[PDB]
Amino acid sequence: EPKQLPELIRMKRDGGRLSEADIRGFVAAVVNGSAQGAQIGAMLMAIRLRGMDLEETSVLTQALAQSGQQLEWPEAWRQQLVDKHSTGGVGDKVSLVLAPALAACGCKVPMISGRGLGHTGGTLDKLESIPGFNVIQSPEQMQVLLDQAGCCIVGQSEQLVPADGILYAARDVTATVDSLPLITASILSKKLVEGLSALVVDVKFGGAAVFPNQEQARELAKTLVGVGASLGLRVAAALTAMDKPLGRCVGHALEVEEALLCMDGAGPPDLRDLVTTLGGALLWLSGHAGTQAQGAARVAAALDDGSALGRFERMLAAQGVDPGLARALCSGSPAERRQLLPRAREQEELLAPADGTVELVRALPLALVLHELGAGRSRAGEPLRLGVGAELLVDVGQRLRRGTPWLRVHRDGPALSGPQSRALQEALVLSDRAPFAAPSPFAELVLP
């Protein structure tokens, strides 16, 4: 029954299970206001150090979900509601494209997304690079968006998965993100509130992924598919590598550009690879395409013929962006899009030390330095340096020459410190091996 908050915390601290009553009451305290900051962090920490189990976990997610509302849409759309959701992520703008992609493929995507988590920027912050983009819509507005645009991207609020919003902000600045339960709940809860026909989850592994260990990551996959099943959700989880940044831009505004470059015609191969791959899965899974190949084939199609660029345009406008700016952003050249989005003060470039063959660029050192540069959050509720970020000037598998520039840093301060500099420079790994074509960051596809 109603136990005082400090008491539930004492229980988890002591490795005790939380009852459905206990989890619920807690969730409520968090949304109703009673629960104080130091209390929410304490609990998150306790959880990050004693975990929970299938039930508590399943209970948590399930509750979080109902802290707010659930959406209901015209029965017409039903079989067309789909969504994908990542975990880790350094430079993962897939969402910024796969959304309008699917919307061009006749699907409706009601995306409840999020902000940077730990050292992994969020697709919600990235969108806020676009001037006037509102990530907060009421269910009502959302339904207008899936009608006009077919898709939309919004974050937690007073009506949607409220409690998740409270924790998710804390998780990131409390060093309480890497927890299978808090992860499973955080994700499933949002996607639940949407009520989708099919749902694909992006589970990163290696390098800069929340859970580095491939297998210990593959579990997180069978898990989200696990609980997700029970909750009554069709869930497909795919393990994709995260040792190097997806694409060539890590940041916010920079990333919004490398996304437009995709819809345009095509930018980075890996970026496209996943958008089509994951996209084709959703169509197959939602039973909207013969096989994944066919599925994936239609998405690629969207990419190549301006569809996604169109859907995307309606979307920005539909979500607060000055119509004019939006036609300018999409029909704009890359040079235009640069002068229209947030740019950092100065920007230097790291040169190649030795002749050699780019083996890979270390994602973690990057994300970590850029974080220190204002591309990451230090303490919830704070602005973000949206211009700041980084550009990969060489592509993995290729051969570069000593002295050539391989990475450009956009910073808002008067310079990089010694530690930050060395950090960057060593994130570059060179071999004498012969140049080669980059592999797909896509590994397996855990099914339900």
Residue numbers in the entry: 32 to 479
Please quote the paper that reports this structure.
Human thymidine phosphorylase (hTP, EC 2.4.2.4), identified as the sole endothelial mitogenic and angiogenic factor, belongs to the pyrimidine nucleoside phosphorylase (PyNP) family. Thymidine phosphorylase, providing pyrimidine nucleotides for DNA repair and replication, has also been shown to have angiogenic activity in vivo. Here, we report the crystal structures of recombinant native hTP and in complex with 5-iodouracil (5IUR), a substrate with a Ki of 0.48 mM. The active site is located at the interface between the α- and the mixed α/β-domain.
The crystal structure of native hTP (at 3.0 Å) consists of two non-crystallographic dimers in the asymmetric unit. All four copies of hTP contain residues 34–479, residues 32 and 33 can be observed for chains A and B while only residue 33 can be observed for molecule C. At the C-terminal end, residue 480 was observed only in chain B. The crystal structure of hTP–5IUR complex (at 2.5 Å) consists of a dimer per asymmetric unit. No secondary structure differences were observed between native hTP, hTP–5IUR complex structure and the previously reported hTP structures. The crystal structure of unbound hTP provided some interesting findings. Alignment of the molecule A of the two structures (hTP and hTP–5IUR complex) indicates that they align well (including the flexible loop regions and the hinge region), with an rmsd of 0.57 Å over 445 Cα atoms. The ‘key hydrogen bond’ between His150 and Ala239 previously proposed to form the phosphate-binding site is present in both bound and unbound hTP structures. Hence, it is unlikely that only the binding of phosphate would trigger the formation of this key hydrogen bond as it is also observed in structures where a water molecule is present instead of a phosphate ion at the phosphate-binding site. Since no structure is available for the transition states of hTP, it is not possible to say conclusively whether any conformational change occurs during catalysis. It is evident that presence of substrate analogue is not required for the enzyme to acquire the ‘closed’ conformation. However, it is possible that the closed conformation observed for both bound and unbound hTP is favoured by crystal packing, while different ‘conformation/s’ of the enzyme may exist in solution.
